[PDB]
DNA sequence: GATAT
RNA sequence: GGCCCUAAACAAAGGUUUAGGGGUAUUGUACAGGUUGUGCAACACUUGGAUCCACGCUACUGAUUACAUUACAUAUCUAUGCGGCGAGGUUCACAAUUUGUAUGUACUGAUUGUGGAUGAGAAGGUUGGAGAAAGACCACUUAGCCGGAGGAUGUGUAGAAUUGUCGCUAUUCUGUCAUCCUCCGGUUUUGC
């Protein structure tokens, strides 16, 4: 068989409770609804992604940093092929309801639009440019994937497929994705005696089925979502279900913005309203009142309101608007400062590791009577300078080309000499 | 490998 | 202890409890069973040509049958750019001669062959194993940025820059020029 006829099939790289399968067995298995009705779903494996925000106070320069935790849960190989196949089925029915309601340009994330974040941010900044004096209201949903109510998700799933109730294979998948069960990966590796430093060594699955049934389940390692809300982040079906859940609210928010002569955009849980200035104080309370039917809440700490006025002939914002990795002040478009900061930390760690490897092999050349060598820097230039083809600078120059910004080019210009000075440091 | 959530 | 199957009990719910069983890597050969023709063929489906013939092709079923071979998500960009040349040796363990001896044996240096490892374009540490050695394997670990203003100093449409090195490409820069110092402002804007 050929993968090109079956776009849902992807081979995945992690270890789980079962082994990777071939295209022939996946295609024969997932196409039978009786197999889906009789399937034995394995638990998800789970861990937390760690993130830090550092924010010194600008009055007295005191340290403050906050740890942020994102719970992540990923499914087994055969389960991941079942979810990908049914997400492929649900996407075609979802896109027809997108085209019916003219929502094609409002809903941005997780759709195969052949567009990136640069084009979405460019479209938002061109709307403010055409609209003139206006306000941008930015809203964020609080705990989006963890707070989806299961009955609302079931009702939205029946409308997309167009039935009164879910069929049996769809209902089995809905049961597995809502009342899900998960096993903590570190506890499983501790109990089974698997090294956290090298797990794929002389094994192709985490354990035997006897070892699963005796050591995993009887030790209490399976934790079941018995609350009435939440779906796991890390399944192949979850992002589509997050788009399906929000559809009627997207229709209502497009109508609300269009009544007032404005525009509406949503990228996952990130929402942008571009409205005339007289509505900008009411808007967050109107959106907080109409989203209570979805049982999800706005994160009121993350609300940002910006205002654009003409100063001379140039449109000027009172503070710059951040949107999808870019900064816009009314005329100029810049990259986020945190993306350039992240590039700087990655570059410095790479150069420091290259110097450590240089020192390590120079000791060996001294021991065996060979002449010392300098720093090899093909890989450093491929990773961290413009000669590379798949790095941060190709993204930056691509963004400077698309958005027509000399300011992005002036941001990217000192990065060559900083890499050279870090090498000479 | 790079970007957005 | 979630999930699936079987059986029972209470009843009729997209049910609860008890008891027992289970978790399909890959590619083939046997073996076992269905549906059917007249013991031993035949088996699926999209599609084409005139029920029949043919192409594509998951080829009646087998995880619950044997045997054997082979080895974090979604969307987007792109797939450490490609190709020559370094390389003579060094090290470790055996084996065969000969180098100096004692009595073929017991030592000792060097030449000659076979096998492990290694230079090559940066994946770091440890008195930790294994090992004949290994640069390999196993075990345990590993304020910053952006915008603006003032200065001080240098400098100028073809040329410059970029990997151990060369070639073919490719990308970036070129007076709102570069490095460094000072001041002001921003950073709900960092997915292990
Ligand atoms: K080369
Ligand atoms: Mg926001």
Residue numbers in the entry: 1 to 425
From the paper:
Here, we show that in the DRT2 defense system the reverse transcriptase binds a neighboring pseudoknotted non-coding RNA. Upon bacteriophage infection, a template region of this RNA is reverse transcribed into an array of tandem repeats that reconstitute a promoter and open reading frame, allowing expression of a toxic repetitive protein and an abortive infection response. The system consists of a 280 nt ncRNA upstream of a gene for a 425 amino acid RT-domain protein with no additional domains. Our results demonstrate that upon phage infection, the DRT2 RT reverse transcribes the template region of the DRT2 ncRNA into a concatemeric repetitive ccDNA that then templates transcription (“forward transcription”) of the ccDNA into a repetitive neo mRNA that is then translated into a toxic Neo protein.
The region of the ncRNA 5′ to the template (“5′ handle”) forms a hairpin that docks into the finger-insertion domain. The 3′ region of the ncRNA downstream of the template is intricately folded and intimately associated with the elongated thumb domain of the RT. One long 34-nt hairpin (the “tower”) and a shorter 18-nt hairpin (the “buttress”) form A-minor motif interactions and rise against one side of the thumb, an interaction which is secured by a potassium ion-stabilized pseudoknot that wraps around the other side of the thumb. The rest of the template region is loosely bound to the RT, as evidenced by weaker cryo-EM density, but template bases 29–37 and 86–135 are visible as three helices forming a three-way junction. The final eight nucleotides of the template (bases 141–148) are visible within the RT active site. Strikingly, template bases 142–146 are already annealed to a 5-nt DNA primer “GATAT,” we therefore refer to these template bases as the primer-binding site (PBS). We conclude that the “GATAT” DNA primer is covalently linked to the 3′ end of the ncRNA and is synthesized by the DRT2 RT. The 5′ phosphate of the primer G and the 3′ oxygen of the ncRNA C278 (the last RNA base clearly resolved in the cryo-EM density) are separated by 11.7 Å, which would readily be bridged by two additional RNA bases. Instead, we saw that the incoming dNTP binding site is blocked by a guanosine nucleotide from the 3′ end of the ncRNA (G277) which forms a non-Watson-Crick pair with template base C141.
